[PDB]
Design a protein around this nucleic acid. Structure first.
Lengths: 49, 44
RNA sequence: UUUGGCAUAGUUCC
C-alpha cells in the first residue's frame, strides 16, 4: 500500500530479507570546501589535501 | 641577443632565496647543497 | 595564528 495516500499500489512489489553491508565510505569523512585558506611555500599556491 | 661565446659558462648565476627556500631545524635544498659543493671546488 | 619535505603501500571513481 502507498504510504502517503493509503491506496494499493497497482503493481505488486518484490520484498524480502536480504543481507546488506555498510561500507567504510561515509560522507562526513569526504565533505570538503575551501575559500582562501592556507597556501604552499614554494609556489604560493593553495595547499594539497 | 645570443653571442656564441656566451654559451661557455664562466660566471654562474645563483638563484635567489625564493627559488631555493629554507625549510623549517633548518634544512638546505638540493640546489643549495649543489651550490655549496660547486663553490667549494671553485675556491679549491 | 600559525604552516616541514621525500619515498612506498592501499582504496574510491570513470
Amino acid at each position: 500500500y502507498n504510504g502517503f495516500t493509503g491506496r494499493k499500489i497497482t503493481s505488486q512489489i518484490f520484498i524480502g530479507p536480504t543481507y546488506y553491508q555498510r561500507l567504510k565510505h561515509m560522507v562526513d569523512d569526504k565533505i570538503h570546501s575551501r575559500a582562501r585558506g592556507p597556501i604552499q611555500i614554494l609556489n604560493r599556491q593553495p595547499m594539497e589535501g | 641577443y645570443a653571442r656564441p661565446e656566451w654559451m661557455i659558462v664562466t660566471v654562474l648565476p645563483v638563484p635567489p632565496l625564493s627559488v631555493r627556500p629554507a625549510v623549517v631545524a633548518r634544512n638546505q635544498d638540493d640546489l643549495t647543497h649543489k651550490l655549496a659543493d660547486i663553490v667549494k671546488i671553485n675556491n679549491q
